[PDB]
Design a protein around this ligand. Structure first.
Ligand code: 7L2
Length: 187
């Protein structure tokens, strides 16, 4: 039997998709829910095609895609010393860019797009918010300047962002202890 004709295409990592819905009745951790996991190309698309586009979520929702075993929270062992490359969208870009950026971000993750530094990647998060949406790739160590910088440059190019745009990298330790947070790095 030729495996090319019937086997699914395994991804390098198993990934977990999480959903968050704002409910002021509950703690933030209590609002976070794991949706399902996948570790093949075919199961990724089955999941993606089943769920709402980010642009159709009510305000205050997040999606997070993280490597299996890493919860999408600062407190996780693999995030607490890490940080994130932040894409900040204005209100008009929810129409133009939110969904295509998020899908490109998903592919950067599952397709292992950062060469040897894809091991520093933990996951990605999209925040759907009335004041402006955000997409971010989370990495495991905010001090690994080489890995962080490589991921930032590849990511910015893969999104198609012009050089008129600067994106910033922020430590979670800064984000947790704080409206805005300083950048450690920019590309
Ligand atoms: C990624 N992450 C986000 N959060 C929480 O989400 C909020 C993140 O705030 P930040 O300013 O960094 O992001 P952003 O601009 S997208 O704000 P947001 O719209 O998510 O929240 C706006 C406000 O709304 C309130 N909020 C947000 N989420 C919740 C929530 O789930 N439950 C309640 N009761 N209130 C909430 C809170 O007052 C917050 O300041 C913080 O709110 C509280 C509940 C104080 O904890 C923070 C986190 N908390 C923990 N412990 N760990 C995280 O990884 C983490």
């Amino acid at each position: 039997a030729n495996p090319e004709h019937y086997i699914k295409h395994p991804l390098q990592n198993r990934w977990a998709l999480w959903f968050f819905k704002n409910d002021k009745s509950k703690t933030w951790q209590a609002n976070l829910r794991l949706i399902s996991k996948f570790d093949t190309v075919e199961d990724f698309w089955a999941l993606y095609n089943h769920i709402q586009l980010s642009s159709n979520l009510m305000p205050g929702c997040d999606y997070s895609l993280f490597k299996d075993g890493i919860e999408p929270m600062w407190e996780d062992e693999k995030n607490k010393r890490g940080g994130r490359w932040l894409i900040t969208l204005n209100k008009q870009q929810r129409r133009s860019d939110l969904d295509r950026f998020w899908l490109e971000t998903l592919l950067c993750l599952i397709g292992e797009s950062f060469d040897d530094y894809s091991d520093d990647v933990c996951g990605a998060v999209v925040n759907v918010r009335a004041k402006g949406d955000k997409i971010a790739i989370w990495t495991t160590e905010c001090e690994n300047r080489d890995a962080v910088t490589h991921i930032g440059r590849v990511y910015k190019e893969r999104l198609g962002l012009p050089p008129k745009i600067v994106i910033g990298y922020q430590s979670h330790a800064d984000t947790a202890t704080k409206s805005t947070t300083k950048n450690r790095f920019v590309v």
